[PDB]
Design a protein around this ligand. Structure first.
Ligand code: CU
Ligand code: CU
Lengths: 273, 78
């Protein structure tokens, strides 16, 4: 099972991915992923328990969450895998990612409503149910709130950071995890959520299917970092309050540890690494 | 040590803040009387659940950012 750059999918792969996502939404399964993520986003805090975000487990937690979602996709269509969006390469509103045969484009200026693609509210196939902003249609403002996506040079600067994470293991940390997450530095992952806008900029960001392709690329960058720094590994490694240590299990699953997730090749490979 | 309270009309909407499936908030914000979940980061900045990835300096700034995001829409409670 190979995760491919979105820019390379065939028409058939795009069709099958879209259909499987829309079936997970139809059946009610999709919205429970949105709900799980929102609960962690709203509970993880820099001075208290933190698991999904703003913490060393940001990367293995999103790895397992994306595996849960890919497994659900595969239960509808076993050929489908999660594609990734290299936002350092495919950085304009003109990328085929945002075409009507894939995710559809940006929102209209009046109310941010996405008007084309399979997830536009007018299709009847993508109600926004799990929400805080009361509106029930997918919204985006590509490039609205921040002008540019991160560049390859910026990604490279973060990939060169040797330490995985550092105390205090939160949004103030130095180290790779927090620079990739983006709370410090040139800002990679947080800035992409802000760039897409709409629900992707909120606490219910998996409402936009681009969520998965963004995090699949963030997950790819972790794998690339591992290759660059084979003498560097997940920290902390035991006895840290409020923080998932290497061999501690992670909510919500409780049955998996960061240790079980460091090597993606047990689950999937990339088209190229 | 929590920020001061505030109360103003911003873009036609009432935003209020006060020291006090989601976190431990020592500060509460409201938009037209509906509570907006907000959070403080280690460096002192704030975010809210409708602008979670874009830290702003203060809870009033987070309330204003939420009003900007909502484009008139009522907030749903958390
Ligand atoms: Cu997240
Ligand atoms: Cu994210």
């Amino acid at each position: 099972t190979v995760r491919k750059n979105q820019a390379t999918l065939t028409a058939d792969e795009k069709r099958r991915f879209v259909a499987a996502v829309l079936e997970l939404k139809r059946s009610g399964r999709y919205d429970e992923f949105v709900r799980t993520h929102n609960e962690f986003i709203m509970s993880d805090t820099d001075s208290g328990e933190r698991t999904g975000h703003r913490s060393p487990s940001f990367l293995p937690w999103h790895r397992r969450f994306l595996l849960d979602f890919e497994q659900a996709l595969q239960s509808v269509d076993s050929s489908v895998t999660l594609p990734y969006w290299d936002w350092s390469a495919d950085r304009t509103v003109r990328a085929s990612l945002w075409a009507p045969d894939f995710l559809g484009g940006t929102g209209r200026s009046t109310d941010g409503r996405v008007m084309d693609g399979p997830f536009a509210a007018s299709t009847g196939n993508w109600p926004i149910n799990v929400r805080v902003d009361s509106r029930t249609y997918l919204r985006r403002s590509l490039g609205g709130s921040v002008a540019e996506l991160p560049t390859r040079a910026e990604v490279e600067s973060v990939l060169a950071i040797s330490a995985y994470d550092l105390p205090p293991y939160n949004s103030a940390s130095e180290g790779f995890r927090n620079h990739l997450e983006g709370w410090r530095g040139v800002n990679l992952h947080n800035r992409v959520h802000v760039w897409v806008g709409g629900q992707m900029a909120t606490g219910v960001s998996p409402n936009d299917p681009v969520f998965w392709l963004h995090h699949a690329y963030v997950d790819k960058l972790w794998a690339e970092w591992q290759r660059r720094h084979p003498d560097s590994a997940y920290v902390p490694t035991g006895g840290t309050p409020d923080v998932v240590d290497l061999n501690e299990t992670m909510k919500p699953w409780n049955t998996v540890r960061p240790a079980d997730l460091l090597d993606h090749t047990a689950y999937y490979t990339f088209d190229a690494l | 040590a929590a920020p001061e309270s505030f109360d103003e009309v911003y873009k036609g909407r009432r935003i209020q803040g006060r020291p006090a499936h989601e976190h431990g908030g020592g500060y509460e914000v409201f938009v037209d009387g509906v509570q907006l979940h907000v959070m403080r980061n280690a460096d002192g900045s704030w975010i809210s659940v409708v602008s979670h990835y874009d830290p702003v300096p203060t809870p009033r700034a987070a309330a204003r950012a939420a009003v900007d995001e909502l484009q008139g829409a009522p907030l749903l409670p958390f």
